[PDB]
Amino acid sequence: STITRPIIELSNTFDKIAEGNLEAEVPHQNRADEIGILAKSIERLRRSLKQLADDRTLLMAGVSHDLRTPLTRIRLATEMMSEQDGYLAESINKDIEECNAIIEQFIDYL
Amino acid sequence: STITRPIIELSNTFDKIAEGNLEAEVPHQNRADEIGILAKSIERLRRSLKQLADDRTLLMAGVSHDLRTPLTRIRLATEMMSEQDGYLAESINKDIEECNAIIEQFID
């Protein structure tokens, strides 16, 4: 059948996938020639990359809350400290705030 | 046709990359036709995947580094807590350990 046009369409599509559009539609998947073989392989790569990305992102979504929990616990603990140790309690609170800043300004974006 | 083999071979290349094999050599880069363009793009992706992996490694390392400083200040601070606040120092130390655990499981 036709060769150069489907090859170009698959190349353009692949460019879209490679640069991060993992939702790009792969054409020519049903072809009974080598163009079809290529298209199926490209679709498999697309699905592979999408799987990687989704797994990683799901994992990432848990990190902020998972750090925030023990940090919050530290705060609760300082709130129980002896009134003689207001200084230490406050110092620790400032460190906690630094950690939270790292979570909000950076980790939340991962 | 004469380009059937190069196309099938590139399909094999795509399949190797999809399987996580980023070390396999991409063939047919040394041509100036459409096949060559595709092959070059595939190679660029392979290299990019490797680079991005490394970049992520260093990224997470940096995150761990940034947290370790204030976390360490807190850990050292607990040593100055009073005897009657010992249960609190222990609780906070355990919290810090939990943070660290989350971080390292994140690293891994």
DSSP code per residue over A77-90: HHTTS-GGGHHHHH
Rounded to 10°, the helix B34-78/B4-18 angle is 10
Token couple for A55: 């797994």
Q: What residues 79-108 of chain B have any CB closer than 8 A to a CB of chain A?
A: 80-82, 84-85, 88, 91-92, 95-96, 98-99, 102-103, 106
Q: Rounded to a whole number, what is the distance in Å from the CA of B14 to chain A's nearest CA? A: 6
Q: Enter the CATH code of domain A1-110.
A: 1.10.287.130
In order of A1, A29, A32, the CA distances from A36 in angstroms are 11, 5, 6
Spatial separation of the C-alpha atoms in residues B101 and A99, rounded to whole Å? 15
Spatial separation of the C-alpha atoms in residues B94 and A42, rounded to whole Å? 48
Q: Is B1 helix (H, G, I), strand (E, B) or coil?
A: coil
Quick one: which of A61, A89, A12 has its CA closest to B34?
A: A12
Across B33-68, b (16+ Cβ under 10 Å) vs e yields ebbebbbbbbbebbeebeeeeeeeeeebeebeebbe
DSSP for A7-63, written as a single string: HHHHHHHHHHHHTT-TTPPPP-TT-SSHHHHHHHHHHHHHHHHHHHHHHHHHHHHHH
Spatial separation of the C-alpha atoms in residues B81 and B92, rounded to whole Å? 11
Query: Angle B18-B107-B62 (CA atoms, 0-180°, nearest 5)?
Result: 110
CB-CB contact of A50 with A20 (8 Å): no
Query: Angle B10-B7-A27 (CA atoms, 0-180°, nearest 5)?
Result: 90
Spatial separation of the C-alpha atoms in residues B50 and B20, rounded to whole Å? 10
Spatial separation of the C-alpha atoms in residues B24 and B49, rounded to whole Å? 13
* Amino acid found at B3: I
Would you call A18 and B48 a contact, using CB atoms and an 8 Å cutoff? yes
Would you call A15 and B41 a contact, using CB atoms and an 8 Å cutoff? yes
Spatial separation of the C-alpha atoms in residues B47 and A99, rounded to whole Å? 34
Q: Rounded to a whole number, what is the distance in Å from the CA of A25 to chain B's nearest CA? A: 16
In order of B90, B91, B95, the CA distances from B87 in angstroms are 5, 6, 12
DSSP for B12-65, written as a single string: HHHHHHHTT--SSPPP--S--SHHHHHHHHHHHHHHHHHHHHHHHHHHHHHHHH
CB-CB contact of B34 with A8 (8 Å): yes
Residue A69 DSSP class: H
Q: Enter the CATH code of domain B1-108.
A: 1.10.287.130
Inter-chain Cβ pairs, chain A and chain B, closer than 8 A: 123
Spatial separation of the C-alpha atoms in residues B75 and A77, rounded to whole Å? 13
Return the H-helix or E-strand segment holding B108: none
Residue B30 DSSP class: S
Quick one: which of A42, A103, A92 has its CA closest to B64?
A: A103
Spatial separation of the C-alpha atoms in residues B57 and A53, rounded to whole Å? 15
